[PDB]
JSON list of C-alpha atoms and ligand atoms in Angstrom, two decimals:
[
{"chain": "H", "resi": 1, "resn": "UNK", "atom": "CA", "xyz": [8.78, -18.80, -0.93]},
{"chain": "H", "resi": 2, "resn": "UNK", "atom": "CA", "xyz": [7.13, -18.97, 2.27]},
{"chain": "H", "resi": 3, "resn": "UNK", "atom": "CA", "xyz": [4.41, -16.96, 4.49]},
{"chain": "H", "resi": 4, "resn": "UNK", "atom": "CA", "xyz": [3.21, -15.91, 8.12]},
{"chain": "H", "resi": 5, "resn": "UNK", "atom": "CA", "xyz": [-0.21, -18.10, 9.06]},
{"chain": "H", "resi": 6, "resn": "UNK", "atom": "CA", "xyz": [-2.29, -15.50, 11.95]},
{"chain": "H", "resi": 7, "resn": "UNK", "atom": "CA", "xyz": [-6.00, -15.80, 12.48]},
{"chain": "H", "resi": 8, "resn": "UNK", "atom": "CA", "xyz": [-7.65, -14.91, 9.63]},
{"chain": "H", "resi": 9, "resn": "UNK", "atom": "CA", "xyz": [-4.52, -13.36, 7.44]},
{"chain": "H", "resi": 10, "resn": "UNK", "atom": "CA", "xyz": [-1.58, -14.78, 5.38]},
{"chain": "H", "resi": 11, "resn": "UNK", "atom": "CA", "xyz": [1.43, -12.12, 5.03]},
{"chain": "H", "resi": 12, "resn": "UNK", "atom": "CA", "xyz": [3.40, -13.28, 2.03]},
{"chain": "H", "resi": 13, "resn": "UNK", "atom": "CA", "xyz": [6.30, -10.79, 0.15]},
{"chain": "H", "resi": 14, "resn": "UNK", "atom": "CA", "xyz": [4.51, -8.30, -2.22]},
{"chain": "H", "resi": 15, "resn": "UNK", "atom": "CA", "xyz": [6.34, -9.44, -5.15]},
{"chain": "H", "resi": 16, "resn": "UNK", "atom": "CA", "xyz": [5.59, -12.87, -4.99]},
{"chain": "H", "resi": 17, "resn": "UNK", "atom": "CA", "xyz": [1.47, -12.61, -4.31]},
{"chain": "H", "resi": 18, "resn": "UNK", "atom": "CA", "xyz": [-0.69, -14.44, -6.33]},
{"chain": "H", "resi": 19, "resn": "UNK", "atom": "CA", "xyz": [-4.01, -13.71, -7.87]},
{"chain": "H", "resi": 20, "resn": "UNK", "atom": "CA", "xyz": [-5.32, -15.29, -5.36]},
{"chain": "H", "resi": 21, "resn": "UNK", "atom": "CA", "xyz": [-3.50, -13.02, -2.84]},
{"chain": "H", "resi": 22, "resn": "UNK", "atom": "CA", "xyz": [-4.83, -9.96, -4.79]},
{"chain": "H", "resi": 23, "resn": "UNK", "atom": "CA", "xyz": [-8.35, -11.34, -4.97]},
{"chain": "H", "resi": 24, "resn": "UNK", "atom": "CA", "xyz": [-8.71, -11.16, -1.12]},
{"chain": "H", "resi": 25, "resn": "UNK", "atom": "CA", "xyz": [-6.31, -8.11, -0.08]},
{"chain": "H", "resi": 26, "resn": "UNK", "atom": "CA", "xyz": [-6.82, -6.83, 2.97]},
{"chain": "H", "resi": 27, "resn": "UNK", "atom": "CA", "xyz": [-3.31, -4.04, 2.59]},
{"chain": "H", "resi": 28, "resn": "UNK", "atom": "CA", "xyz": [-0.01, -3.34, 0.79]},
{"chain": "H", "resi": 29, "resn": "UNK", "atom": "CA", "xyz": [3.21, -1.98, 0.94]},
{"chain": "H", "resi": 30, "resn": "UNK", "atom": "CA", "xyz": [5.54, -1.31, -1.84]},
{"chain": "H", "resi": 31, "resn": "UNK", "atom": "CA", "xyz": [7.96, 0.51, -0.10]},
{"chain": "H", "resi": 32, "resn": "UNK", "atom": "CA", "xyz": [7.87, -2.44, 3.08]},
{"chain": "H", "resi": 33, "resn": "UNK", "atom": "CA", "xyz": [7.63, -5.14, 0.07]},
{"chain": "H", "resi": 34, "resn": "UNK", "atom": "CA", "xyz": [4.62, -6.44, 2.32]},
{"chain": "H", "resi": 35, "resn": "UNK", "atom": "CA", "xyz": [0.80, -7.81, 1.39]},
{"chain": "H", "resi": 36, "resn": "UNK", "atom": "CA", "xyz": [-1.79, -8.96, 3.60]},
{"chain": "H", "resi": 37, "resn": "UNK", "atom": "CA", "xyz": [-4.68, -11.40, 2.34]},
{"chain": "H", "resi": 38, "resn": "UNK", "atom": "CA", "xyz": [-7.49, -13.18, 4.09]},
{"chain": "H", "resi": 39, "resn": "UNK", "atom": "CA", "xyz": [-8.18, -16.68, 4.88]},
{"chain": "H", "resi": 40, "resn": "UNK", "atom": "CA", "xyz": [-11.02, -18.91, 5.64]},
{"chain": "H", "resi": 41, "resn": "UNK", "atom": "CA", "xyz": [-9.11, -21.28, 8.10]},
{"chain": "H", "resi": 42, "resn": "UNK", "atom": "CA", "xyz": [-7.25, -19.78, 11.17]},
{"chain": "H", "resi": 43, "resn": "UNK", "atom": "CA", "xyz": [-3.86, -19.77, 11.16]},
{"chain": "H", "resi": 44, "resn": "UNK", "atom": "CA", "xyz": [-1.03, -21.40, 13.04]},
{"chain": "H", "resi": 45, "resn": "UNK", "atom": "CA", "xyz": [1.48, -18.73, 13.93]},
{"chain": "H", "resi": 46, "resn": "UNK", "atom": "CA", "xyz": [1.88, -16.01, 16.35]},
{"chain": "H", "resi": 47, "resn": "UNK", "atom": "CA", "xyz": [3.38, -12.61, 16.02]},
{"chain": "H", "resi": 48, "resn": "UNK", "atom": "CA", "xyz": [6.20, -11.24, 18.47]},
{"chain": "H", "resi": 49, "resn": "UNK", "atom": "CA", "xyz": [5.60, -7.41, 20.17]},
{"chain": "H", "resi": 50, "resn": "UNK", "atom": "CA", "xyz": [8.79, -7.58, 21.62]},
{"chain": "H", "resi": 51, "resn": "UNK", "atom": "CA", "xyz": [12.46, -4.97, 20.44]},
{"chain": "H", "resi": 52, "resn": "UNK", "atom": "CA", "xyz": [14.45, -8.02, 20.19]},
{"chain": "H", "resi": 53, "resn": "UNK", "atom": "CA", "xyz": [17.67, -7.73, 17.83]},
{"chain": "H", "resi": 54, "resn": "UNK", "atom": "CA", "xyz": [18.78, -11.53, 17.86]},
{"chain": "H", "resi": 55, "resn": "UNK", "atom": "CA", "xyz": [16.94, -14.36, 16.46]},
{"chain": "H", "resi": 56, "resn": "UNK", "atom": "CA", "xyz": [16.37, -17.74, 13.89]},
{"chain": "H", "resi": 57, "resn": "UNK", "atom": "CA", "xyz": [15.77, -17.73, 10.04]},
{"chain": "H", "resi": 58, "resn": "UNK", "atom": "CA", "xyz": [15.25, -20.13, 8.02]},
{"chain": "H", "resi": 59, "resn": "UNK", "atom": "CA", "xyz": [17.15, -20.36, 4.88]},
{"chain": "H", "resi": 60, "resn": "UNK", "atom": "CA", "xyz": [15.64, -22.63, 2.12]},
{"chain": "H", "resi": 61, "resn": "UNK", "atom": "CA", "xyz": [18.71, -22.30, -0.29]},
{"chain": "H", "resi": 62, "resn": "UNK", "atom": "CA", "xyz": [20.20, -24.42, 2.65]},
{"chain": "H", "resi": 63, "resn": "UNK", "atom": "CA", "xyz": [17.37, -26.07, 3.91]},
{"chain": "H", "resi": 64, "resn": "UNK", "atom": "CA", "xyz": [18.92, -25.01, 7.64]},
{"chain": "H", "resi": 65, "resn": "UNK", "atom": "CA", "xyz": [17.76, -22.57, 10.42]},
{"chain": "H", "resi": 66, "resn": "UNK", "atom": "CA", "xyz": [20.49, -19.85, 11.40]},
{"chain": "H", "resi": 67, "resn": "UNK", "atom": "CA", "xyz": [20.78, -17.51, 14.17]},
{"chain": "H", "resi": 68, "resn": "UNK", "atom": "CA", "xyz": [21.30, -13.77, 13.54]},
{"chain": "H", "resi": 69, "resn": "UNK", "atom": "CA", "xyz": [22.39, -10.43, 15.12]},
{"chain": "H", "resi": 70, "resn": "UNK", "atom": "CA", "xyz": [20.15, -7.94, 13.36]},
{"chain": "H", "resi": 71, "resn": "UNK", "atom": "CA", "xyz": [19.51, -4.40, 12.89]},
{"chain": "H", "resi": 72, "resn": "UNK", "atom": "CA", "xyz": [16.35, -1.92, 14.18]},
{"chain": "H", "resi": 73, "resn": "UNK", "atom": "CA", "xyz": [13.43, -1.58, 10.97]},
{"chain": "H", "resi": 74, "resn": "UNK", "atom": "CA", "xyz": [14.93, 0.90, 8.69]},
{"chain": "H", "resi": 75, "resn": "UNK", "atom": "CA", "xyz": [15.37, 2.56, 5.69]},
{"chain": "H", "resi": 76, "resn": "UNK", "atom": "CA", "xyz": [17.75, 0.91, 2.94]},
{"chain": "H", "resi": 77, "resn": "UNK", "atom": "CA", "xyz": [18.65, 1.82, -0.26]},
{"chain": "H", "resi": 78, "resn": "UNK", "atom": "CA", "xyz": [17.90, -1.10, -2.63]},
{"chain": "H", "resi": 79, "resn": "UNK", "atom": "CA", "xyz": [18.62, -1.65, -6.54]},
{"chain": "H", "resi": 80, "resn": "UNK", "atom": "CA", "xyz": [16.17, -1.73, -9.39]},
{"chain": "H", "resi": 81, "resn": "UNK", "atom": "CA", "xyz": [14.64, -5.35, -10.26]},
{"chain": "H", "resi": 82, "resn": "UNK", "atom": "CA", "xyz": [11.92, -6.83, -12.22]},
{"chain": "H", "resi": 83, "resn": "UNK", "atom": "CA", "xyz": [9.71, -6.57, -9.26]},
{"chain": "H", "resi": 84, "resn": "UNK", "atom": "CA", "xyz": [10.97, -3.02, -8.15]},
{"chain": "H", "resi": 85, "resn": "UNK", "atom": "CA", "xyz": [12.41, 0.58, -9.41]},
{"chain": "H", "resi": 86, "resn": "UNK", "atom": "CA", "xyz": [15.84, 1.46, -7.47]},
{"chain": "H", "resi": 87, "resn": "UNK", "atom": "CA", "xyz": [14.20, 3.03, -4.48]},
{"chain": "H", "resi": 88, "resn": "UNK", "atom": "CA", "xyz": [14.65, 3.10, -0.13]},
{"chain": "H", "resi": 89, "resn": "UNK", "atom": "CA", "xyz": [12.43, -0.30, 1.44]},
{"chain": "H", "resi": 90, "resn": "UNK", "atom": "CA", "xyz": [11.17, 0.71, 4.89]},
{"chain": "H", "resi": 91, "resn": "UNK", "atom": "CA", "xyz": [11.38, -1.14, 8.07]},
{"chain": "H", "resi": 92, "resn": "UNK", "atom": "CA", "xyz": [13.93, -3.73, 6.80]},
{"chain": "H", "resi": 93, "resn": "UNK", "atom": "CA", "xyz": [16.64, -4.95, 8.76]},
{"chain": "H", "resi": 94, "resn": "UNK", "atom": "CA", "xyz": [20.00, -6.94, 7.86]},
{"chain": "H", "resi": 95, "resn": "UNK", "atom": "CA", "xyz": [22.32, -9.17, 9.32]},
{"chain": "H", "resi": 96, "resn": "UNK", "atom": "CA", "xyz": [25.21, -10.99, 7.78]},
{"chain": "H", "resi": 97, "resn": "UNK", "atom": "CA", "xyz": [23.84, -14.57, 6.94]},
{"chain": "H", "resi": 98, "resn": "UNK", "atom": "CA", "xyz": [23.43, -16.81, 3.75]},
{"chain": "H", "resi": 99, "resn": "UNK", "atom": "CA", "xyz": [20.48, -15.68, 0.99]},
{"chain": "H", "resi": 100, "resn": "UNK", "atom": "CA", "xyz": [19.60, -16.39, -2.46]},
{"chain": "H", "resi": 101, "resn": "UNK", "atom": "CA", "xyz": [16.80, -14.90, -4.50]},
{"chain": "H", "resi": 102, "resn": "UNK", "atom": "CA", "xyz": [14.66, -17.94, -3.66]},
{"chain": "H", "resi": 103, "resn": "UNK", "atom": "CA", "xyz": [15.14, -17.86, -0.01]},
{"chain": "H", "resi": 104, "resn": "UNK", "atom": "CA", "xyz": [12.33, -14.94, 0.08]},
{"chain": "H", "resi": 105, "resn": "UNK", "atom": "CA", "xyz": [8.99, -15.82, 2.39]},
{"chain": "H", "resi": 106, "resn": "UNK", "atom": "CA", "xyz": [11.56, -17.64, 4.96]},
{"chain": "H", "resi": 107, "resn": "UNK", "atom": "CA", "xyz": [10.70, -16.70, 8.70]},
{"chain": "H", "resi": 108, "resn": "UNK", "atom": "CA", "xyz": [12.88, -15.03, 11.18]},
{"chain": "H", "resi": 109, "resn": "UNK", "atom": "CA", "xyz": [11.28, -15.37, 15.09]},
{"chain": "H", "resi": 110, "resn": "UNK", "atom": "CA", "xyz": [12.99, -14.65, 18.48]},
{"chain": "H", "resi": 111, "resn": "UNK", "atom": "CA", "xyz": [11.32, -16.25, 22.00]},
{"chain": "H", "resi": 112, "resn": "UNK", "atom": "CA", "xyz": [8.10, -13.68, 21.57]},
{"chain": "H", "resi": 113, "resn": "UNK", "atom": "CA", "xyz": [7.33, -15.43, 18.15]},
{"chain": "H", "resi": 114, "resn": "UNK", "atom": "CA", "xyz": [7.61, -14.31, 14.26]},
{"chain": "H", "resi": 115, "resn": "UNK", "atom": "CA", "xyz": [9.59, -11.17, 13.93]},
{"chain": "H", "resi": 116, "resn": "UNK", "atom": "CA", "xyz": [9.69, -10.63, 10.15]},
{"chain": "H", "resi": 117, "resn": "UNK", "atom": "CA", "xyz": [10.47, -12.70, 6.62]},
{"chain": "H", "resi": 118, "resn": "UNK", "atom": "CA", "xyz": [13.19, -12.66, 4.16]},
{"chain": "H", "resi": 119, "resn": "UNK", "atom": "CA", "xyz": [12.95, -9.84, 2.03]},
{"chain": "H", "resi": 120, "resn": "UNK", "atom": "CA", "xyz": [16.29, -8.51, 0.34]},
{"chain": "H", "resi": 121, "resn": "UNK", "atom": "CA", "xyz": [20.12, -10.06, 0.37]},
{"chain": "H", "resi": 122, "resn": "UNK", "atom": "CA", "xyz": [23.42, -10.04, -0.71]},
{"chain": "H", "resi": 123, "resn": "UNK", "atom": "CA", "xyz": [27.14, -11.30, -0.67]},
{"chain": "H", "resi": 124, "resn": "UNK", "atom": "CA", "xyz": [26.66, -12.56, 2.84]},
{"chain": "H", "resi": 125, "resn": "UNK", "atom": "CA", "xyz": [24.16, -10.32, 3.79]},
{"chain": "H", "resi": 126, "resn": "UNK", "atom": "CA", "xyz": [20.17, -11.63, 4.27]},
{"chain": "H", "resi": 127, "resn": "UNK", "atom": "CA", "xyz": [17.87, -8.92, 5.15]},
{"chain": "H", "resi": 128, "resn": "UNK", "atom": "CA", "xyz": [14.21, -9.01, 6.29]},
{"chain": "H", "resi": 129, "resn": "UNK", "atom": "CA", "xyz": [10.71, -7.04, 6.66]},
{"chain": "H", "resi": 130, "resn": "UNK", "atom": "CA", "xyz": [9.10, -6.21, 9.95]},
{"chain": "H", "resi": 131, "resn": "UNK", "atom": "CA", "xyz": [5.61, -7.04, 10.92]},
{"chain": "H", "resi": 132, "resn": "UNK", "atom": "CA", "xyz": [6.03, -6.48, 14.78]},
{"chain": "H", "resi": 133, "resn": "UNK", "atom": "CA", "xyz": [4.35, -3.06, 14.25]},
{"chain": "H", "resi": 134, "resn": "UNK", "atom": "CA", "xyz": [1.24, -4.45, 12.56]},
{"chain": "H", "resi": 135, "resn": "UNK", "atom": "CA", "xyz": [-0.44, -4.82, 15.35]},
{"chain": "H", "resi": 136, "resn": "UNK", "atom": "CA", "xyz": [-4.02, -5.48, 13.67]},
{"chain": "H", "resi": 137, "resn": "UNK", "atom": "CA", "xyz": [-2.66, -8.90, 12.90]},
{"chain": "H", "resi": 138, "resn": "UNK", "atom": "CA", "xyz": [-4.15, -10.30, 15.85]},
{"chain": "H", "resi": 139, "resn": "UNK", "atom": "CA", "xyz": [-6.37, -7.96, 17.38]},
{"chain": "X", "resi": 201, "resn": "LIG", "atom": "C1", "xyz": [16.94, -13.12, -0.25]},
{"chain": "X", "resi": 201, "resn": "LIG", "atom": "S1", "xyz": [16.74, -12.02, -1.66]},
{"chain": "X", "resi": 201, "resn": "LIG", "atom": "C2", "xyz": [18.34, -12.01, -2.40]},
{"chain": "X", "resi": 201, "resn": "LIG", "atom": "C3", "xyz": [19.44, -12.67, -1.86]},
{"chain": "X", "resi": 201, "resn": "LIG", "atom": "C4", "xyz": [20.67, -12.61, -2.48]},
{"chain": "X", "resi": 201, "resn": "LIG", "atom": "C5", "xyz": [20.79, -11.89, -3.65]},
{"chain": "X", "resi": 201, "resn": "LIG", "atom": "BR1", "xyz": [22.47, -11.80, -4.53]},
{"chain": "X", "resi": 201, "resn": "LIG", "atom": "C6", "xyz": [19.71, -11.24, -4.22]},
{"chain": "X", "resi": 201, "resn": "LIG", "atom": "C7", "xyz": [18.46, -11.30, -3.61]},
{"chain": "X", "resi": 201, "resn": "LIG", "atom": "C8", "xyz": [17.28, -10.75, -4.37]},
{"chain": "X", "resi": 201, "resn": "LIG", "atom": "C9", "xyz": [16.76, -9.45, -3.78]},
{"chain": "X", "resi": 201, "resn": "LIG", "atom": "O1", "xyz": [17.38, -8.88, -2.89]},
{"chain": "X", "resi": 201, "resn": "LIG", "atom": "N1", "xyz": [15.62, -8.92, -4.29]},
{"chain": "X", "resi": 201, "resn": "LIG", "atom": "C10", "xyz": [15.08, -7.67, -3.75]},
{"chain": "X", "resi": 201, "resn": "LIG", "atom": "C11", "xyz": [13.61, -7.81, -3.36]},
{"chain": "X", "resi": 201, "resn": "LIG", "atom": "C12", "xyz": [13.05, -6.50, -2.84]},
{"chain": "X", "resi": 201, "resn": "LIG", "atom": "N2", "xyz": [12.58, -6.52, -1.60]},
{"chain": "X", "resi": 201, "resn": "LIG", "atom": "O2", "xyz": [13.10, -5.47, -3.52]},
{"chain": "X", "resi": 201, "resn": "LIG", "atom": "C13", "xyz": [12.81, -8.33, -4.57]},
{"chain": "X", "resi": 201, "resn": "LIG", "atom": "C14", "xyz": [13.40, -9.63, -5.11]},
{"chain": "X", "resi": 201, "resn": "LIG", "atom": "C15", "xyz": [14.89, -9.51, -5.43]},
{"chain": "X", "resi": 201, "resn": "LIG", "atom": "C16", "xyz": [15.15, -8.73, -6.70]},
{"chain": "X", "resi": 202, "resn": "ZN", "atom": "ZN1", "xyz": [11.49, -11.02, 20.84]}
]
């Protein structure tokens, strides 16, 4: 669990959105594994515009923050789920790190601010969605 706090939005993972997060949508992205819904209060993060490829996650299945080396927003294959057919998430990018199902909605941020959130993993392997693109978030 977990989720980005900017201005008037909350960006949570698409397959873990409530009714509530449904109920005031703003925009979605199966194939990113994204959703956007509005607030009344004003958040209290920032979002980094920035092509940094290092930076800090934090893992709840630990309850620790790590530092990664990770790769540019692509596309990558991932298996069928509940949540999802077998199909090719966009703008996700791996690193080798420490994930478990759970650990979803964690943030990853570099010195600019919030990069992305957990998304996917594996056998050593975390990987996580973009949002430096969106650039509506705060403008
Ligand atoms: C940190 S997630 C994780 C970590 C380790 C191991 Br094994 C497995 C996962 C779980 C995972 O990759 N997905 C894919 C995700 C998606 N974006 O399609 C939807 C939830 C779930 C099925
Ligand atoms: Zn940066």
């Amino acid at each position: 669990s977990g989720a980005i706090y900017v201005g008037n939005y909350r960006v949570v993972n698409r397959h873990l959105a409530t009714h509530n997060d449904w109920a005031n949508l703003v925009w979605e992205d199966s194939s990113r594994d994204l959703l956007v819904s509005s607030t009344t209060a004003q958040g209290c993060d920032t979002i980094a515009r920035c092509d940094c490829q290092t930076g800090v996650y934090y893992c709840s299945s630990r309850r620790k923050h790590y530092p990664v080396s990770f790769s540019k927003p692509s596309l990558i294959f991932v298996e069928a789920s509940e949540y999802y057919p077998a199909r090719y998430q966009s703008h996700l990018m791996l690193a080798v790190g420490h994930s478990e199902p759970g650990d979803c909605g964690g943030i990853l941020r570099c010195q600019h601010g919030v990069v992305g959130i957990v998304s996917t993993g594996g056998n050593g392997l975390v990987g996580f969605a973009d949002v430096r693109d969106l650039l509506w978030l705060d403008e």
